[PDB]
Amino acid sequence: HYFVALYRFKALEKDDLDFRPGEKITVIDDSNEEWWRGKIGEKVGFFPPNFIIRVRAGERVHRVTRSFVGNQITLKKDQIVVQKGDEAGGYVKVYTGRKVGLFPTDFLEEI
């Protein structure tokens, strides 16, 4: 299992982790529920856990590339979503952290 940033976090303190949507984060210390400690590349630091999403082993992470309302899920440009199942008919099920459902393969780019 691994973690991806859902949102931008800008470091406010020296020991803050700074990161962008889509970056992979290795969690060191998840003992505190307001502030986890983790690492990106060489940098170690603190960040708020709500800013990242856990991803199953071998799951695929995508950035939404175009705002699209569905009939079967809505998503906005630059959202981070996790892919569920395999594609079919130009769509695949993607998970937002709160909603699950089918979204156009062509409005996604993998990260």
UniProtKB/Swiss-Prot annotation:
Coiled-coil parts of chain: none
Location in the cell: Cytoplasm; Cell membrane, Sarcolemma; Cell membrane, Sarcolemma, T-tubule
SH3 domain boundaries: 1-57, 58-111
SS bond list: none
Superkingdom of this protein's organism: Eukaryota
UniProt disease link: Congenital myopathy 13: An autosomal recessive disease characterized by congenital weakness and arthrogryposis, cleft palate, ptosis, short stature, kyphoscoliosis, talipes deformities, and susceptibility to malignant hyperthermia provoked by anesthesia.
Subunit structure: Interacts (via SH3 domains) with the calcium channels CACNA1S and CACNA1C. Component of a calcium channel complex with CACNA1S and CACNB1. Component of a calcium channel complex with CACNA1C and CACNB1.
Purpose of the protein: Required for normal excitation-contraction coupling in skeletal muscle and for normal muscle contraction in response to membrane depolarization. Required for normal Ca(2+) release from the sarcplasmic reticulum, which ultimately leads to muscle contraction. Probably functions via its effects on muscle calcium channels. Increases CACNA1S channel activity, in addition to its role in enhancing the expression of CACNA1S at the cell membrane. Has a redundant role in promoting the expression of the calcium channel CACNA1S at the cell membrane.
Protein name as annotated: SH3 and cysteine-rich domain-containing protein 3
Source species: Homo sapiens
